[PDB]
RNA sequence: GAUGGGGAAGCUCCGUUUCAAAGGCCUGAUUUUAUGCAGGCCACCAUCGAAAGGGAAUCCGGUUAAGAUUCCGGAACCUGG
RNA sequence: GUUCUUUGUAAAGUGCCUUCGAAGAGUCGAGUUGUUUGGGAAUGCAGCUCUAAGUGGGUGGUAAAUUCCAUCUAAAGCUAA
RNA sequence: UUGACCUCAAAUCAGGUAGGAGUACCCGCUGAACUUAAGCAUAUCAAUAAGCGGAGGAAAAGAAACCAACCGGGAUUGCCUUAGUAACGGCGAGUGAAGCGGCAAAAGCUCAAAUUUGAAAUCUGGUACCUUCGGUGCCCGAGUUGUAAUUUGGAGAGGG
C-alpha cells in the first residue's frame, strides 16, 4: 500500500538490496562451488508474503 | 480501612462470644494506684544495660588481673527476672517471690497456664497492664512477663 | 520451659478454652487475604520444633485452601472413554491441602526456601496452615551451619518437587514391607523393574 | 599501518580526544572520495585507527574508575566479575567452611588417623 | 482525649516523605560518549547528476544521513561541520532504507562554493 | 495362537520394552574406570588400607544360619571390651554399628579376639611430626580373613 | 485488556470500578533553598481499539526522464512560547 | 618437607556411686469414598467425619475378642560413592 | 500534651533475590485411547504417550516407628539371583514384587522438648581502618512470645 508502515519499509529495502545477481569475482576464488544466487527472488514468480 | 476494620471488630466479637473462664481470668487486672507503687518497686531492680555490664566486665578483667579474684570482685546482683521459660522454670521450682503476667499477649495461649500454675506452686501473680510496660521495665520492646525471685533487706 | 505447656495444650482442641479461640481466630483469618505474611507463629513451639527460629531470615506466612475433592475440569462430564474414567465427582488429588498450600506460597515468594507448614485452624470451606520460609540470601543463614544447607541450589522449590515434610509423606517414601512400590520413588522402581538387563555374554 | 596502542597510552585524555576527533576529520574526508575513486582501501586503516583510539580512551577511564571504587564493598556490576551466575550466587569459602563449634570439638578431639597395617 | 474531627467518609492514603535515591555505587560507572554526534549524523554527500543539479539551482546541499538523525541533529551539525547558516531541512528515506537530507542553505551562502570547498563537484 | 505340543510361555514383552532396554556394552570400560577408581582412592589415602575392618556374624536365616560371614560393623559392646571408644575407633579404620546386639558369647568373643590382633597388627602415627612410612597393604578383609568355626 | 482481589495442581481463568489506605492541581510561600514546610481544590479511577467516525491550520502559478497541496516564486493560516 | 605463631589458666575423652532421664497432635489410629498396588475382610495415597495415649505407640501379609512374645521409636532435619 | 508497644502501610529509600532458555537422564502432578481379550463393558495397553510444575552434574533415597522368627541380621543405592515365583486376575487374556545369599561402593549424623539467670554470653546492617571469599573498633537495630554454650536415645544430664 501507498500508507505503509516502517516495519514494512525496511524488509522492502533489505529484499531490494538481495535483489541482485552473483557478483562475477566470486566464481574466481579457489575451491569456489558457487555457481549462481540460488536465493534470488522476483516480484512476478514468488511473494514475501510479509 | 480493612485493617482497622479487623481490629475493631475482633475486640467486638471477643466479647460478644460467651469466654470460657480461662480467659476473663485476665481482664480483672491491677488497680491503678497499687500498678503504679508496684511498678515503682520493681524499678529499683533492674537489668544492667550494656554500657554498665561493659565497665563491669572491664572492672572484673582488671581485677582478675590484680588479685585472682574467681570472678568474686563484683558483689551479688538483685534484678528482676524476665523471659517466659525462666519465670516457668522458677515457679515450678519455687523460686519466685512474685509474678507479674502481662494482661495482652497476643497468644494468649502463652500464658493462660500462668494464674493456675502460680496457684498450685503458691507463688503469688498479678495480671497487670502493659506487655510494653513490663519491656520498659526490663528494658526491652515487650516483656509479657516478670518476676522479682530475691529482694534486699 | 512454657512450650510443653503449648503443646499439650494444643491437644485439647475440644476443650471451650481451644474452640473458643478457634472460633475467633478463624474469622480473623477469613477477614484478612488468601496470602498474607503473618507477624509472628501463632504456634511458636510448633514452629520451633518444625526448625523455626527467631532470628533475621525467618518468614512465616499464612495461607487458606479450599476444602474437598477435586472436580475432574471436563466439559460438561464427558470424558470420552471407556466407562472406568467415567468419574467425574468423587476424584481426589493425590497431594495434601497442606502440599498446595506451601506450593501456592513458594510461587507467592520465590526468593524465599520452604521449610516446613502446620495446620492453625478450619471451617468448612478453608483449611488454613502457617508456612515457615526461610530467606537464604540473607547473612545470618548465609552463615550459621546449622542453616546453611538450604543456600546449596539443588534446593530450590522443595516443596514443588515434593522434598518437605508432607510431599515425602504423599509421595509415600518410607522404609519397609507396606511401601514396596514407593520407596526408592515410583517411577524410578517402575523403571527398574521394567527395563530388560542384556549382557555381553547372555546369562 | 594506524596508530599503535601502546604509544596511545602514554597520552593523556585530551590529547586522545584531539587525536580522535582529527581521525574522524579523516575519515569524513576519505569517505567523500570513495565516491569518486573506485577503490580506497586507505578506509580501513582510518577505521581501525579510530577503534583503538576509542579502547585506549574507554580503558584509562575504566581503570579509574576502579581506583576509585578500590578497597571498599559496593563497587559497580560491570567492574565486579561475571562468571556465571550460579557461581555468583554460591556460597563463599568462608560460609562454606563456616561449622558449628560442636562439630569443631568433635573434629579437634577425634580427627581422621593416618595408619597403616603390616606389623 | 479527643478524637480528629473529619469532615469526609472517606479515608485516603497519607502523604508521606519520599525520599531521593542516594546509591552506594554508580550503575554503569563510565557515562557513554555521545551516541550520535556531528560525524555520525552526516555520512556522506549524494553525488548523482539529479543532486548536482540542485547545487547551483536550488542552493540546496544533499547528505546521506544517519537513520536516527532529526532536522535538529542535521541543522546543527551542518552548523558545526560547515560553519554555514541554514534555511531548511526536508529529510526522506529512501528505497534503499537509507535517509536522505536536502538542506536548503540562507542566501548568504552558496551551495556550489561549499561543496567544493568540501571535495566533490 | 495355541498350538502343538509345546510348554505355555510367559513372556512379557506386551508393554513398550524397546524403550527400556540396557544392553552392557560398558562392561569392560566400566571394570576398568572401576579399577582406575580403586588405584587413585589408594593413593588418596596412601597408608591406609582402602577398607574398614569389619566383624564376623552369623547369617540369618534357618537356610544360611550353618554359615557364618562378615558384618557391617562391631558392636560398642565389643569395642569396649577391646580396650578403646568407639570414635577412636572409627578414626583409626574400625566399622562401628550401634544397632547390633551381643547375644551369642562365642561371636562376641571372636569378634573381641578380631579386634585384638587388628590391634597388635596396625601401626598407628603420630598426629604431628615424622610419618615412618610403612608400605600399605589394600584389603583389610585379605590381612583378616573369615573363618568358619 | 493489566492492577486490587477471587478461582485453578497448573499452563492460566474471572472481572474493569470491583469487599483497595488506588492520586495530581494550581496559587504560592521561602528567597541557608531546595522545593519541603503555609495553605486550599478535586475524586475520574490503567491502557489498547477507526489511514471511511470525531479532529487546530495552505492556496495559486511554475518545475522533473521519473516527485509534489511536500520542491521553487508569491500570498496566507494555526498552535506553542 | 621447611618456617612463624602457642593456641590454652581453654576444650575433649575415659572409671565408680547416686538422683534423674524432658523424645515432635486435627497427628497416629478408625469409618467411609475414590484411585492405585502382586497386597488378597482392604498395599500406598488423597477427600470428608470421628479423633488418642504414655510400662505408650507402630509393625509382625486372614477379619474379631482374650493372654503373651519379638522387633523398632513415627507425626522435625542434613549427608559423598 | 508527650513518649512507648502492637498491627498495618508508603517511598525511583540501602542492599539483594525470582521469572526465561535447555530438558537425554531426575523429582512430582495430571492423564488417555488405538491395541489384546479372536466380539465387549472389569481388565490390558499403562500407574504409559500428550499436558503442567521444579532441579543438578547427577538427581532422588539414606542412617530403621526396618527385615525377620534364626545360633538372628543392621543406612541408602546398583548388579547377579530370588522369579516369571508368593500373589492379583470376566481366576480369562494377562499381570506380578519382597526377605535371605554373592558382589560393587561404603560414612556418618543434628534440631525441638532443660534456668546462663552471678549477669543475651548470640546475630544482620551502617561507619572508620586493615593484610578484603574476610578481620577489628564504634554505633543503631534484631532478639527474652528466646538468639548463643550444653544433649539427640547408640544416649545423655545434675551432683560426689
Ligand atoms: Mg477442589
Known amino acids: ?50 | 480501612p480493612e485493617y482497622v476494620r479487623v481490629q475493631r471488630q475482633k475486640k467486638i466479637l471477643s466479647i460478644r462470644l460467651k469466654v470460657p473462664p480461662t480467659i476473663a481470668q485476665f481482664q480483672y487486672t491491677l488497680d491503678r494506684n497499687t500498678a503504679a507503687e508496684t511498678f515503682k518497686l520493681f524499678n529499683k531492680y533492674r537489668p544492667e544495660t550494656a554500657a554498665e555490664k561493659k565497665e563491669r566486665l572491664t572492672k572484673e578483667a582488671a581485677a582478675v588481673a590484680e588479685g585472682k579474684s574467681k570472678q568474686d570482685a563484683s558483689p551479688k546482683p538483685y534484678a528482676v527476672k524476665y523471659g517466659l521459660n525462666h519465670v516457668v522454670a522458677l515457679i515450678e521450682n519455687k523460686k519466685a517471690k512474685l509474678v507479674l503476667i502481662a494482661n495482652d499477649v497476643d497468644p494468649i495461649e502463652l500464658v493462660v497456664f500462668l494464674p493456675a500454675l502460680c496457684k498450685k506452686m503458691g507463688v503469688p501473680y498479678a495480671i497487670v497492664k502493659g506487655k510494653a510496660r513490663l519491656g520498659t521495665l526490663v528494658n526491652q520492646k515487650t516483656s509479657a512477663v516478670a518476676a522479682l525471685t530475691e529482694v534486699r533487706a | 520451659g512454657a512450650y510443653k505447656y503449648l503443646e499439650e495444650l494444643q491437644r485439647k482442641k475440644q476443650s471451650d478454652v481451644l474452640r473458643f479461640l478457634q472460633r475467633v481466630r478463624v474469622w480473623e483469618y477469613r477477614q484478612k487475604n488468601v496470602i498474607h505474611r503473618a507477624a509472628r507463629p501463632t504456634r511458636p513451639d510448633k514452629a520451633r520444633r518444625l526448625g523455626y527460629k527467631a532470628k533475621q531470615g525467618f518468614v512465616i506466612y499464612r495461607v487458606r485452601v479450599r476444602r474437598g475433592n477435586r472436580k475432574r475440569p471436563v466439559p460438561k462430564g464427558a470424558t470420552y472413554g471407556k466407562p472406568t474414567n467415567q468419574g467425574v465427582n468423587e476424584l481426589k488429588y493425590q497431594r495434601s491441602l497442606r502440599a498446595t498450600a506451601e506450593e501456592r506460597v513458594g510461587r507467592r515468594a520465590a526468593n524465599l526456601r520452604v521449610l516446613n507448614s502446620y495446620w492453625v485452624n478450619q471451617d468448612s470451606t478453608y483449611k488454613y496452615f502457617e508456612v515457615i520460609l526461610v530467606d537464604p540470601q540473607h547473612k545470618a543463614i548465609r552463615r550459621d551451619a546449622r542453616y546453611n544447607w538450604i543456600c546449596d541450589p539443588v534446593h530450590k522449590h522443595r516443596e514443588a518437587r515434593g522434598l518437605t515434610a508432607t510431599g515425602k509423606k504423599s509421595r509415600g517414601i518410607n522404609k519397609g514391607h507396606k511401601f514396596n512400590n514407593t520407596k526408592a520413588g515410583r517411577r524410578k522402581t517402575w523403571k527398574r523393574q521394567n527395563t530388560l538387563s542384556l549382557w555381553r555374554y547372555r546369562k | 599501518a594506524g596508530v599503535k596502542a601502546y604509544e596511545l597510552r602514554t597520552k593523556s585524555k585530551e590529547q586522545l580526544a584531539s587525536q580522535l576527533v582529527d581521525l574522524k576529520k579523516e575519515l569524513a574526508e576519505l569517505k567523500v572520495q570513495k565516491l569518486s575513486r573506485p577503490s580506497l582501501p586507505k578506509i580501513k586503516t582510518v577505521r581501525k585507527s579510530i577503534a583503538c583510539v576509542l579502547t585506549v580512551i574507554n580503558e584509562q577511564q575504566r581503570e579509574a574508575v576502579r581506583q576509585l571504587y578500590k578497597g571498599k564493598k559496593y563497587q559497580p556490576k560491570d567492574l565486579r566479575a561475571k562468571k556465571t551466575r550460579a557461581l555468583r550466587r554460591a556460597l563463599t569459602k568462608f560460609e562454606a567452611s563456616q561449622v558449628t563449634e560442636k562439630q569443631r570439638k568433635k573434629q579437634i578431639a577425634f580427627p581422621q588417623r593416618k595408619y597403616a597395617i603390616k606389623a | 482525649k479527643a478524637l480528629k474531627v473529619r469532615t469526609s467518609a472517606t479515608f485516603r492514603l497519607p502523604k508521606t516523605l519520599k525520599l531521593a535515591r542516594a546509591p552506594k555505587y554508580a550503575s554503569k560507572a563510565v557515562p557513554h560518549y555521545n551516541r550520535l554526534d556531528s560525524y555520525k549524523v552526516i555520512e556522506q554527500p549524494i553525488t548523482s547528476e539529479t543532486a548536482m543539479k540542485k547545487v547551483e539551482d536550488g542552493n540546496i546541499l544533499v547528505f546521506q544521513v544517519s537513520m536516527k538523525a532529526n532536522k535538529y541533529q542535521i541543522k546543527k551539525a551542518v552548523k558545526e561541520l560547515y560553519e554555514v547558516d541554514v534555511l531548511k531541512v526536508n529529510t526522506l528515506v529512501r528505497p534503499n532504507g537509507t535517509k536522505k537530507a536536502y538542506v536548503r542553505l540562507t542566501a548568504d551562502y552558496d551551495a556550489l562554493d561549499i561543496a567544493n570547498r568540501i571535495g566533490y563537484i | 495362537a495355541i498350538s502343538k505340543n509345546l510348554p505355555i510361555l510367559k513372556n512379557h514383552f506386551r508393554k513398550h520394552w524397546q524403550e527400556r532396554v540396557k544392553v552392557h556394552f560398558d562392561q569392560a570400560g566400566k571394570k576398568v574406570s572401576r579399577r582406575n577408581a580403586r588405584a587413585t582412592r589408594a593413593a588418596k589415602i596412601a597408608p591406609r588400607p582402602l577398607d574398614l575392618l569389619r566383624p564376623v556374624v552369623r547369617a540369618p536365616t534357618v537356610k544360611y544360619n550353618r554359615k557364618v560371614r562378615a558384618g557391617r560393623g562391631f558392636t560398642l559392646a565389643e569395642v569396649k571390651a577391646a580396650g578403646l571408644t568407639a570414635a577412636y575407633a572409627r578414626t583409626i579404620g574400625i566399622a562401628v554399628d550401634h544397632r547390633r546386639q551381643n547375644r551369642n558369647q562365642e561371636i562376641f568373643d571372636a569378634n573381641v579376639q578380631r579386634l585384638k590382633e587388628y590391634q597388635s597388627k596396625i601401626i598407628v602415627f603420630p598426629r604431628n611430626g615424622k610419618a615412618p612410612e610403612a608400605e600399605q597393604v589394600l584389603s583389610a578383609a585379605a590381612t583378616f580373613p573369615i573363618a568358619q568355626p
Open chain 1, 1 to 50: 500500500a501507498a500508507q505503509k508502515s516502517f516495519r514494512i519499509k525496511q524488509k522492502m529495502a533489505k529484499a531490494k538490496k538481495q535483489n541482485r545477481p552473483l557478483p562475477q569475482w566470486i566464481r574466481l576464488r579457489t575451491n569456489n562451488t558457487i555457481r549462481y544466487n540460488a536465493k534470488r527472488r522476483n516480484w512476478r514468480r514468488t511473494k514475501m508474503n510479509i
